[PDB]
């Protein structure tokens, strides 16, 4: 009995691997990797940071780092600036909708890794009110854990996409 059942189990895994995987893989299409930002920015090296979908909305909000490609004829220009352009793409065909506006970073916030920024949905503003309403060791002015711990930036970037906005948080990883 033990031999016969194990005889079926090893043969059963063969059916799944040899045949079922063959059929399932066929009904599954993988789109080739494509560049969409090239049309809008063909002379810049593109660095991508984060992108999420707004619920009940068919638009893709993305955060990109745009660094213009410096040709071999312009020597050592100080325009090697990392620009955190924010745009929108329709979810299906990834089509650009609104003209990107470069967010001006204040000089005090230049000492943070912009690449580590992640998207945080679902009413981040609620915690801001509750932090001051709870007698915790957390102070809001910047949300700071006491006077002796790491400081993390909560960039409530008001990207007005058709009247709605998302929320961002800038983690601290000092360079």
């Amino acid at each position: 009995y033990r031999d016969l059942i194990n005889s079926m189990s090893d043969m059963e895994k063969d059916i799944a691997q040899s045949n079922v995987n063959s059929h399932i893989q066929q009904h599954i299409l993988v789109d080739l990797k494509t560049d969409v930002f090239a049309q809008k920015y063909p002379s810049s090296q593109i660095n991508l940071l984060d992108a999420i979908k707004l619920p009940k909305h068919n638009y893709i909000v993305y955060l990109i780092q745009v660094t213009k490609h410096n040709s071999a004829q312009e020597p050592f220009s100080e325009e090697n600036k990392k620009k955190l352009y924010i745009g929108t793409l329709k979810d299906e065909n990834l089509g650009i909708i609104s003209k990107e506006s470069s967010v001006k970073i204040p000089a005090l916030f230049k000492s943070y890794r912009l690449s580590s920024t992640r998207f945080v949905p679902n009413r981040v503003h609620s915690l801001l009110r509750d932090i001051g309403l709870s007698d915790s060791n957390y102070h809001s002015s910047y949300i700071r854990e006491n006077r002796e711990n790491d400081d993390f930036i909560a960039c409530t970037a008001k990207v007005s996409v058709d009247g709605r906005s998302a929320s961002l948080v800038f983690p601290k990883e000092k360079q």
Binding site: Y1, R2, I5, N6, S9, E12, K13, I15, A16, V20, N21, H23, I24, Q25, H27, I28, L29, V30, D31, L32, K33, T34, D35, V36, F37, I46, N47, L48, L49, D50, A51, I52, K53, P55, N58, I60, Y62, I64, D91, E92, L94, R118, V120, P121, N122, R123, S126, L127, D130, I131, S134, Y138, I143, R144, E145, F152, V169, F170, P171, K172
Partner: protein, 247 residues
């Protein structure tokens, strides 16, 4: 609570926060602890994903290749343990796809498994040998929820991405695994984020700006193809189900 982390549950006003002893859960309204998930090293956790369809469960991904899921409403109790054969995990997403098989006259594919009575199990306690109704090892976290009125069977898809090589692994129902080989292995670009549009349609976003789309639409639009996936899953379990009672 100050932290650059925390992901809010889309369906319920709860968040998942990270503290030293483990993953912690607090209510937004009361700031009161609800559950604690014991985790050893944060660096091992590739990412954590919430349940989009229900929000009752929570998914945790390990870099070694292990997936562990804990129910939030059960005070952080572990409910299921998953393993994927020899896979390096970079970032995983959990998606639940609800099937809608409306009755159609052109579909004469009647079912007889429902008419046949459901099986049982033999489990022996200290006092005596007892008989209990049969439940699939993974049915506890997949059973039709009491709180879910729309009890339509829910497809469970775990999507896995491998680091350093950009290999895509899709995992169905907790047992069956399917491997898909990507052609674009020339560049080792780290995947930045994974975004879900609807059920079975996913976009992957790498560091270089390239966009990769994974679509399960053809699979979900074919009634027989999903049945093939379901059938191969039932056969493997019952053979082991028999082997359990044989020993």
């Amino acid at each position: 609570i100050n932290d650059y982390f925390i992901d809010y549950n889309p369906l319920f006003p709860i968040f998942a926060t990270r503290i030293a002893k483990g993953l912690a859960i607090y209510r937004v309204s009361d700031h009161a602890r609800l559950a604690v998930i014991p985790i050893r090293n944060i660096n091992l956790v590739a990412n954590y994903d919430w349940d989009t369809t229900t929000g009752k469960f929570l998914s945790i991904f390990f870099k070694d290749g292990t997936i562990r899921i804990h129910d939030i409403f059960k005070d952080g109790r572990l409910v299921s343990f998953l393993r994927i054969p020899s896979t390096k995990i970079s970032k995983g997403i959990w998606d639940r796809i609800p099937l809608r098989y409306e009755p159609n006259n052109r579909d004469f594919a009647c079912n007889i498994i429902d008419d046949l009575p459901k099986l049982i199990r033999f489990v022996k306690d200290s006092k005596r040998i007892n008989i209990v109704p049969y439940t699939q090892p993974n049915s506890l976290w997949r059973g039709p929820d009491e709180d879910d009125l729309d009890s339509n069977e829910k497809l469970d898809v775990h999507v896995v991405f491998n680091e350093g090589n950009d290999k895509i692994t899709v995992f169905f129902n907790g047992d069956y695994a399917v491997f898909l080989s990507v052609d674009n292995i020339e560049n080792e670009n780290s995947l930045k984020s994974i975004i879900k549009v609807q059920d079975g349609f996913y976009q992957c976003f790498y560091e270089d700006g390239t966009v990769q789309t994974l679509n399960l639409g053809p699979l979900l639009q074919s009634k027989s193809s999903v049945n093939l996936l379901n059938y191969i899953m039932v056969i493997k379990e019952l053979i082991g189900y028999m082997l359990t009672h044989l020993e």
